[PDB]
């Protein structure tokens, strides 16, 4: 079945709008529904904070205390991770699942206790829960995988040619190696002018730009193959081209009624919205995560086209057995696509 590292159950305690919340998710595309201002963002914020997020890592809560609802004294977060298939590290120590406990008090340090199958504490260090999260290939650190309502709105909105390139590069962690290894203009140039073998550092640095250019070809190619395979659900064709000279993401598309592919910014709202949703899906492909979330993909796409976006999401994500999606959307939309097919766990 699906390899280990998917969330079984989530239990809350006196959160922003939930007093005692309990949800159960599946090992695949997992919709949950509601309406505006129903605490839908609360569960995503909790699931981000419960693993690696900090007090000011969301730009919505100023600290680790405003999360507690006014009048309440403390808060508690507890998650369950499956360990049955590949990825069940030292399963004999705990069992077939891993339980973490994040308790935040009104005053004092926050305990990060880690529990076993039967719920007894086995560790409390942040490093232990962090290595557990990063083993199951969880992208907790990343600020894209568990996109917020406004963070995801920053991508799926009015963009230009040299803006989607920035979003894709930042999301794919390709604006980290082009800065951690771009200060060579002073470490190899200005760090040698003292006599006009200490050049061993420049030797390693030249055998490290290969690492970046051989991980920007095989990572920006996997996000381009899954953009031509997602334009085939509207009977379209096309691709997307990276321009390093301009740092641009010009996307070229060709419709059934069209004879020659034109630029995306020449069509109506629907095709542009579909293309940007396809790019949003393509961004996640190269980076091998295990849990992906999203919130409010209905920022500007109409419901008539939001249905098409839903069908796209369902075909692209449901079949994967190694990416547990936790998409959040208010309206119930299990009435158009093949939600009855095994691989969807719509929850309210």
């Amino acid at each position: 079945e699906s390899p280990s590292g998917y969330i079984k159950k989530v239990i809350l305690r006196n959160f922003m709008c939930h007093e005692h919340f309990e949800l159960e998710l599946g090992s695949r595309l997992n919709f949950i529904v509601g309406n505006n201002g129903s605490g839908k963002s609360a569960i995503l914020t909790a699931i981000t904070i419960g693993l690696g997020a900090k007090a000011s890592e969301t730009n919505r809560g100023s600290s680790l205390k405003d999360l507690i609802r006014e009048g309440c004294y403390s808060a508690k977060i507890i998650l369950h991770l499956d360990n049955s298939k590949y990825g069940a590290y030292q399963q004999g120590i705990f069992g077939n699942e891993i339980i973490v406990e994040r308790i935040i008090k009104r005053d004092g340090p926050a305990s990060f206790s880690l529990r076993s199958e039967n719920g007894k504490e086995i560790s409390n260090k942040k490093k232990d829960i962090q290595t557990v999260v990063d083993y199951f290939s969880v992208p907790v650190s990343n600020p894209m995988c568990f996109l917020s309502q406004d963070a995801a709105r920053s991508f799926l909105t009015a963009s230009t040619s040299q803006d989607k390139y920035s979003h894709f590069m930042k999301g794919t962690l390709l604006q980290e190696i082009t800065e951690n290894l771009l200060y060579a203009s002073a470490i190899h140039d200005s760090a040698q002018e003292n006599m006009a073998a200490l050049n061993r550092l420049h030797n390693s640095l030249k055998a490290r730009d290969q690492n970046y250019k051989n991980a920007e070809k095989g990572t920006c190619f996997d996000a381009d193959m899954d953009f031509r395979a997602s334009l085939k659900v509207r009977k379209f064709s096309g691709n997307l081209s990276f321009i390093k000279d301009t740092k641009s993401l010009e996307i070229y598309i060709l419709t059934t009624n069209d004879e020659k592919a034109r630029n995306v910014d020449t069509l109506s709202g629907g095709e542009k919205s579909f293309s940007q949703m396809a790019l949003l899906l393509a961004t996640w492909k190269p980076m091998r995560s295990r849990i992906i979330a999203l919130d409010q993909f209905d920022v500007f796409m109409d419901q008539v086209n939001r249905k098409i976006g839903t069908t796209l999401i369902v075909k692209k994500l449901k079949d994967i057995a190694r990416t547990q999606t936790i998409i959040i959307t208010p309206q119930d939309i299990g009435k158009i696509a093949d939600i009855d097919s095994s691989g969807v766990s719509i929850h309210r």
């Binding site: 290894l181 055998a207 490290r208 290969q210 690492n211 970046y212 051989n214 070809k217 095989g218 193959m225």
Partner: protein, 249 residues
């Protein structure tokens, strides 16, 4: 990286080989079916090899003296289509086994050195003709005499001009084969051998044991060791190739 065993080390006798070519080129409209007196400046095959630009006592690679690591040594060589043309005159198909095996091994050593390999003709018709003279069981048992286990750099070279040998040597080196390849992947993985592992992947992919397609746990092993970001340049290649050998059907 820059050193590929260079069978031909000295310079070539460009004046005596030129004379031999002129006599031979008038021996194709007089024979071609019946079997020589065009050449007696090279009475034995060793003399011919010396004429090519090889040194004395030359048929084996041992790597004690960094044998497949000799540098350029920019010596001129004769065209390969003529070196292989002059070489087949010394077959003696119905003769002693030792001379036939000597011819086979000299042919093999002449095949996979950087000088000949980098300046071969795309017509590529003579080498296959020399190949059909032997069966692949005797061309791979009494094969190229490079070592088997650690030496996967000339294995990829062999399976780059004789591709149909891909499943011929993979059942000789790995003599249950599916679990033997992963066993010999850890030994090149828990040894920090990130250069002889790249040519291990390029060699055995495509056979009956390690096919293409989205299906191999190698991409997992080449994902935990990437955290240095400055670790090695032959480890960001090994994962870009393996990401391409999965999207192939």
């Amino acid at each position: 990286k820059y050193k590929d065993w260079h069978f031909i080390s000295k310079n070539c006798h460009y004046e005596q080989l030129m004379d031999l070519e002129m006599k031979d080129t008038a021996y194709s409209f007089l024979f071609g079916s019946s079997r020589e007196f065009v050449h007696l400046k090279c009475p034995s095959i060793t003399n011919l090899l010396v004429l090519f630009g090889v040194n004395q006592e030359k048929l084996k690679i041992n790597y004690e003296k960094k044998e497949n690591s000799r540098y350029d040594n920019l010596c001129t060589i004769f065209p390969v289509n003529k070196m292989l043309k002059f070489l087949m005159y010394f077959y003696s198909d119905d003769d002693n086994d030792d001379v036939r095996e000597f011819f086979l091994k000299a042919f093999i050593c002449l095949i996979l050195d950087r000088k000949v390999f980098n300046a071969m003709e795309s017509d590529h018709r003579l080498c296959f003709k020399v190949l059909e003279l032997f069966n692949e069981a005797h061309f791979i048992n009494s094969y190229f005499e490079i070592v088997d286990k650690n030496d996967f750099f000339l294995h990829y070279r062999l399976l780059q001009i004789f591709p149909h040998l891909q499943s011929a040597l993979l059942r000789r080196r790995f003599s249950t084969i599916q679990q033997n390849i992963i066993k010999e992947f850890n030994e090149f993985f828990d040894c920090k051998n990130y250069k002889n592992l790249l040519y291990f992947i390029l060699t055995m992919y495509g056979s009956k044991f390690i096919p293409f397609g989205p299906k191999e746990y190698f991409k997992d092993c080449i994902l935990d060791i990437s955290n240095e970001t400055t670790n090695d340049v032959e480890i960001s290649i090994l994962k870009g190739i393996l990401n391409l050998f999965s999207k192939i059907r």
